[PDB]
Design an enzyme around this catalytic site. Structure first.
Site, PDB file in Angstrom:
ATOM      1  N   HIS A   1      -1.300   4.320   5.759  1.00 36.52           N
ATOM      2  CA  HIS A   1      -1.225   5.106   4.540  1.00 36.52           C
ATOM      3  C   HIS A   1      -0.529   6.433   4.802  1.00 36.52           C
ATOM      4  CE1 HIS A   1      -4.673   2.388   3.443  1.00 36.52           C
ATOM      5  NE2 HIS A   1      -3.866   2.263   2.405  1.00 36.52           N
TER       6      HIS A   1
ATOM      7  N   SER B   1       0.818  -1.207   0.000  1.00 37.27           N
ATOM      8  CA  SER B   1       0.000   0.000   0.000  1.00 37.27           C
ATOM      9  C   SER B   1       0.853   1.258   0.000  1.00 37.27           C
ATOM     10  CB  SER B   1      -0.925   0.007   1.224  1.00 37.27           C
ATOM     11  OG  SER B   1      -0.155   0.098   2.413  1.00 37.27           O
TER      12      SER B   1
ATOM     13  N   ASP C   1      -4.612   6.016  10.394  1.00 32.30           N
ATOM     14  CA  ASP C   1      -4.461   4.577  10.574  1.00 32.30           C
ATOM     15  C   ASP C   1      -3.002   4.170  10.725  1.00 32.30           C
ATOM     16  OD1 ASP C   1      -3.416   4.528   7.881  1.00 32.30           O
ATOM     17  OD2 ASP C   1      -5.397   4.053   7.083  1.00 32.30           O
TER      18      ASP C   1
END
Ligand code: NA
EC number: 2.3.1.-
Length: 155
Positions: free
Chosen positions: A134, A9, A131
């Site tokens: 990211h 990611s 979070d």
């Protein structure tokens, strides 16, 4: 000038910023990718990068733990390429163990250069989404600049 960037990611997050700085970069990011899934991809897609004089950036571990053996299998598959291996920063119990594997790979292998994103992002919560996984734009630009600076030094 045409490096391979392969990651999870985080590679997705920085891909557009990185392409603006290095337009001919070949970028392969996938949310949720585990390190063990990268080795078959390198063999299916990227054996032309497994050569002296090529440059590969590896950004794996943020989306899941891996073992020493799995990391060595991936690094071996790039052959004599110069490999820029990025340490991780993630709010998970495995973070330290994985960063130690990454550090020891860079210690061993003359063709593996540590990109110490963990150290660079200390004290910069504004680099990260809430979070902790990211990246915000500020983080994508900082990590892009760190990767590019490391490749330009050859360190
Ligand atoms: Na090294």
């Amino acid at each position: 000038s045409s490096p391979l960037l392969i990651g999870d990611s985080v590679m997705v997050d920085i891909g557009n910023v990185f392409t603006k700085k290095i337009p001919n970069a070949q970028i392969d990011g996938k949310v949720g990718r585990q390190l063990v899934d990268a080795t078959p991809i390198v063999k299916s897609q990227y054996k032309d990068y497994a050569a002296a004089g090529q440059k590969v950036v590896v950004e794996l571990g943020t989306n899941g733990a891996f073992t020493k053996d799995q990391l060595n299998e991936l690094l071996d598959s790039f052959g004599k390429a110069d490999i820029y291996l990025v340490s991780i920063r993630v709010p998970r119990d495995y973070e330290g163990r994985i960063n130690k594997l990454i550090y020891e790979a860079a210690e061993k292998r003359s063709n593996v250069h540590l990109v110490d994103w963990y150290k660079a992002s200390a004290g910069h919560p504004e680099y990260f989404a809430y979070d902790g996984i990211h990246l915000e734009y500020a983080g994508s630009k900082a990590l892009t600049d760190l990767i590019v600076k490391t490749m330009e030094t050859h360190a």
